[PDB]
Motif scaffolding. Structure first.
Motif, PDB file in Angstrom:
ATOM      1  N   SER A 123     -17.569  -8.908 -30.517  1.00  9.47           N
ATOM      2  CA  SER A 123     -18.589  -8.419 -31.434  1.00  9.47           C
ATOM      3  C   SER A 123     -20.022  -8.664 -30.970  1.00  9.47           C
ATOM      4  N   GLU A 124     -20.206  -9.468 -29.927  1.00  7.45           N
ATOM      5  CA  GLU A 124     -21.558  -9.756 -29.461  1.00  7.45           C
ATOM      6  C   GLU A 124     -21.973  -9.083 -28.158  1.00  7.45           C
ATOM      7  N   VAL A 125     -21.016  -8.787 -27.285  1.00  9.38           N
ATOM      8  CA  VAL A 125     -21.355  -8.163 -26.009  1.00  9.38           C
ATOM      9  C   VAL A 125     -20.426  -7.014 -25.623  1.00  9.38           C
ATOM     10  N   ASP A 126     -20.884  -6.177 -24.697  1.00 13.53           N
ATOM     11  CA  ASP A 126     -20.095  -5.039 -24.231  1.00 13.53           C
ATOM     12  C   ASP A 126     -19.363  -5.393 -22.946  1.00 13.53           C
ATOM     13  N   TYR A 127     -20.020  -6.194 -22.118  1.00 12.10           N
ATOM     14  CA  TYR A 127     -19.450  -6.638 -20.855  1.00 12.10           C
ATOM     15  C   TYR A 127     -19.602  -8.141 -20.708  1.00 12.10           C
ATOM     16  N   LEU A 128     -18.694  -8.740 -19.944  1.00 22.37           N
ATOM     17  CA  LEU A 128     -18.730 -10.165 -19.667  1.00 22.37           C
ATOM     18  C   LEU A 128     -18.777 -10.355 -18.158  1.00 22.37           C
ATOM     19  N   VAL A 129     -19.668 -11.232 -17.706  1.00 22.49           N
ATOM     20  CA  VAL A 129     -19.791 -11.558 -16.290  1.00 22.49           C
ATOM     21  C   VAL A 129     -19.554 -13.065 -16.230  1.00 22.49           C
ATOM     22  N   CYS A 130     -18.534 -13.457 -15.479  1.00 19.26           N
ATOM     23  CA  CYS A 130     -18.139 -14.853 -15.367  1.00 19.26           C
ATOM     24  C   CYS A 130     -18.445 -15.398 -13.978  1.00 19.26           C
ATOM     25  N   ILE A 145     -23.142  -3.190 -11.334  1.00 20.19           N
ATOM     26  CA  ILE A 145     -21.860  -3.903 -11.284  1.00 20.19           C
ATOM     27  C   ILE A 145     -20.959  -3.652 -12.494  1.00 20.19           C
ATOM     28  N   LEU A 146     -21.537  -3.147 -13.583  1.00 23.61           N
ATOM     29  CA  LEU A 146     -20.782  -2.920 -14.815  1.00 23.61           C
ATOM     30  C   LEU A 146     -19.727  -1.821 -14.719  1.00 23.61           C
ATOM     31  N   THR A 147     -18.536  -2.152 -15.208  1.00 20.46           N
ATOM     32  CA  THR A 147     -17.374  -1.274 -15.137  1.00 20.46           C
ATOM     33  C   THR A 147     -16.274  -1.991 -15.943  1.00 20.46           C
ATOM     34  N   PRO A 148     -15.150  -1.316 -16.234  1.00 18.38           N
ATOM     35  CA  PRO A 148     -14.101  -2.004 -16.998  1.00 18.38           C
ATOM     36  C   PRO A 148     -13.616  -3.314 -16.381  1.00 18.38           C
ATOM     37  N   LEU A 149     -13.437  -3.332 -15.063  1.00 20.12           N
ATOM     38  CA  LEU A 149     -12.968  -4.536 -14.382  1.00 20.12           C
ATOM     39  C   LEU A 149     -13.475  -4.607 -12.949  1.00 20.12           C
ATOM     40  N   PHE A 150     -14.134  -5.705 -12.587  1.00 15.26           N
ATOM     41  CA  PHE A 150     -14.621  -5.837 -11.220  1.00 15.26           C
ATOM     42  C   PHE A 150     -14.358  -7.209 -10.600  1.00 15.26           C
ATOM     43  N   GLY A 151     -14.166  -7.202  -9.280  1.00 16.75           N
ATOM     44  CA  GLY A 151     -13.950  -8.418  -8.516  1.00 16.75           C
ATOM     45  C   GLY A 151     -14.987  -8.396  -7.402  1.00 16.75           C
ATOM     46  N   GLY A 189     -15.394 -17.098  -8.203  1.00 13.58           N
ATOM     47  CA  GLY A 189     -16.716 -17.386  -8.732  1.00 13.58           C
ATOM     48  C   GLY A 189     -17.586 -16.263  -9.269  1.00 13.58           C
ATOM     49  N   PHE A 190     -17.107 -15.025  -9.229  1.00 10.49           N
ATOM     50  CA  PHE A 190     -17.903 -13.907  -9.724  1.00 10.49           C
ATOM     51  C   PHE A 190     -17.007 -12.713 -10.029  1.00 10.49           C
ATOM     52  N   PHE A 191     -16.661 -12.546 -11.303  1.00 12.63           N
ATOM     53  CA  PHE A 191     -15.837 -11.423 -11.723  1.00 12.63           C
ATOM     54  C   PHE A 191     -16.276 -11.052 -13.134  1.00 12.63           C
ATOM     55  N   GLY A 192     -15.828  -9.901 -13.613  1.00 15.83           N
ATOM     56  CA  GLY A 192     -16.214  -9.488 -14.950  1.00 15.83           C
ATOM     57  C   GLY A 192     -15.673  -8.127 -15.327  1.00 15.83           C
ATOM     58  N   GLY A 193     -16.260  -7.529 -16.360  1.00 12.69           N
ATOM     59  CA  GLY A 193     -15.828  -6.220 -16.819  1.00 12.69           C
ATOM     60  C   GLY A 193     -16.042  -6.126 -18.320  1.00 12.69           C
ATOM     61  N   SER A 194     -15.332  -5.218 -18.982  1.00  7.83           N
ATOM     62  CA  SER A 194     -15.458  -5.094 -20.432  1.00  7.83           C
ATOM     63  C   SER A 194     -14.866  -6.365 -21.041  1.00  7.83           C
ATOM     64  N   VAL A 195     -15.245  -6.689 -22.269  1.00  7.93           N
ATOM     65  CA  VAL A 195     -14.706  -7.891 -22.891  1.00  7.93           C
ATOM     66  C   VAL A 195     -13.181  -7.816 -22.937  1.00  7.93           C
ATOM     67  N   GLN A 196     -12.664  -6.653 -23.313  1.00  9.31           N
ATOM     68  CA  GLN A 196     -11.225  -6.453 -23.396  1.00  9.31           C
ATOM     69  C   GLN A 196     -10.512  -6.736 -22.074  1.00  9.31           C
ATOM     70  N   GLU A 197     -11.007  -6.165 -20.980  1.00  8.10           N
ATOM     71  CA  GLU A 197     -10.366  -6.380 -19.682  1.00  8.10           C
ATOM     72  C   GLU A 197     -10.503  -7.810 -19.174  1.00  8.10           C
ATOM     73  N   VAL A 198     -11.648  -8.432 -19.429  1.00 10.31           N
ATOM     74  CA  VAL A 198     -11.849  -9.804 -18.989  1.00 10.31           C
ATOM     75  C   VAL A 198     -10.916 -10.739 -19.760  1.00 10.31           C
ATOM     76  N   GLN A 199     -10.720 -10.472 -21.046  1.00  6.69           N
ATOM     77  CA  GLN A 199      -9.833 -11.323 -21.825  1.00  6.69           C
ATOM     78  C   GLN A 199      -8.384 -11.118 -21.384  1.00  6.69           C
ATOM     79  N   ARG A 200      -8.043  -9.901 -20.974  1.00  5.00           N
ATOM     80  CA  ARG A 200      -6.686  -9.636 -20.498  1.00  5.00           C
ATOM     81  C   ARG A 200      -6.434 -10.408 -19.204  1.00  5.00           C
ATOM     82  N   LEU A 201      -7.434 -10.440 -18.328  1.00  2.00           N
ATOM     83  CA  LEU A 201      -7.298 -11.151 -17.059  1.00  2.00           C
ATOM     84  C   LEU A 201      -7.161 -12.659 -17.271  1.00  2.00           C
TER      85      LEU A 201
END
Ligand SMILES: CC(=O)N[C@H]1[C@@H](OP(=O)(O)OP(=O)(O)OC[C@H]2O[C@@H](n3ccc(=O)[nH]c3=O)[C@H](O)[C@@H]2O)O[C@H](CO)[C@H](O)[C@@H]1O
Ligand SMILES: CCCCCCO[C@@H]1O[C@H](CO)[C@H](O)[C@H](N)[C@H]1O[C@@H]1O[C@@H](C)[C@@H](O)[C@@H](O)[C@@H]1O
Ligand SMILES: [Hg+2]
Ligand SMILES: [Hg+2]
Ligand SMILES: [Hg+2]
Ligand SMILES: [Hg+2]
Length: 266
Positions: A123-130, A145-151, A189-201
């Motif tokens: 509910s707070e963000v569209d993408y997550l970068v970890c 870098i934004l996309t559904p899932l990135f490595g 040390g650097f991955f991310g994507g949509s909140v949904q895809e990041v939570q799935r990973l």
């Protein structure tokens, strides 16, 4: 969604490659992000029209809280400037988090750890970068870098053959990857994507690690080994070049890297 406005920029050249020294697209047609492949003005327009919000997460436990100041100060100078950013700092020392001045439209949440919902991210963000905290931004890291899932390609193996990749090689591990499999060696040390895809990973990684623990085994490179297994089976929609996670002290500044954007702190 909404139409882009009139924009004046160089016409793309169909008969002229962006880069002739590197691969810019994976075999599953995901772009590999290198300087020279994207027009940031077009991308900024596309994401701003969507009023995109990017969450940046970091963990800083124990001695690592000492890296927060430089991490946050440089992020303010190079990370998603112009867009909505929400920093999430997970630490065991809330009072030790430095008071960093943030630009408008940017906020920081300090979450104390030793335990303490993922629904909040949705509910707070569209993408997550970890990312890792003992790093600093030295150049632009934006919406390209934004996309559904990135490595991100590990800086020490981007030119290696799969057999040399330090994947987990024991069949007893859920992170197991045989010598004849593998696309790239992604770094944890650097991955991310949509909140949904990041939570799935992260949910998949968590489960795989619990299974390994039960069978009394620990992947050679822990979380990173599982990340690689996940991205092998679920292809990222974008792959970031080593420009996005480099160590100049250990690797210098190769010609193939036009920019060093995010680096290790000596
Ligand atoms: O500590 P830990 O003793 O668990 O980990 P460690 O020193 O073996 O480091 C693993 C890597 O994880 C990263 N790391 C570790 C701990 C933390 O709060 N934040 C973080 O980003 C960092 O990039 C480090 O290089
Ligand atoms: C960067 C050059 C690659 C070889 C150096 C060892 O790099 C380590 O590689 C393993 C997997 O094989 C893990 O990914 C480690 N986390 C890597 O070391 C860490 O990352 C590198 C880039 C350096 O910053 C190093 O100091 C870190 O410990
Ligand atoms: Hg190009
Ligand atoms: Hg994350
Ligand atoms: Hg995990
Ligand atoms: Hg993971």
């Amino acid at each position: 969604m909404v139409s882009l406005p009139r924009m004046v920029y160089p016409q793309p050249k169909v008969l002229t490659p962006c880069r002739k020294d590197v691969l810019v697209v994976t075999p599953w047609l995901a772009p590999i992000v290198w300087e020279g492949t994207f027009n940031i003005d077009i991308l900024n327009e596309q994401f701003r029209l969507q009023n995109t919000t990017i969450g940046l997460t970091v963990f800083a436990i124990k001695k690592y809280v000492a890296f927060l100041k430089l991490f946050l100060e440089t992020a303010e100078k190079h990370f998603m400037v112009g867009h909505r950013v929400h920093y999430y700092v997970f630490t065991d020392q809330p009072a030790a988090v430095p008071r960093v001045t943030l630009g408008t439209g940017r906020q920081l949440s300090v979450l104390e750890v030793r335990a303490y919902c993922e629904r909040r991210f949705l509910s707070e963000v569209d993408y997550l970068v970890c990312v890792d905290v003992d790093m600093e931004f030295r150049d632009h890291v934006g919406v390209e870098i934004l996309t559904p899932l990135f490595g991100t390609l590990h800086p020490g193996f981007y030119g290696s053959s799969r057999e040399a990749f330090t994947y987990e090689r024991r069949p007893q591990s859920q992170a197991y990857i045989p010598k004849d499999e593998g696309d790239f060696y992604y770094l944890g040390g650097f991955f991310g994507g949509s909140v949904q895809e990041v939570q799935r990973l992260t949910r998949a990684c968590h489960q795989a690690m619990m299974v390994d623990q039960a069978n009394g085994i620990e992947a050679v490179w822990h979380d990173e080994s599982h990340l690689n297994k996940y991205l092998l089976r679920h292809k990222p929609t974008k792959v970031l070049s080593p420009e996005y996670l480099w160590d100049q002290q250990l690797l210098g500044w190769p010609a193939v890297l036009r920019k060093l954007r995010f680096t290790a702190v000596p």
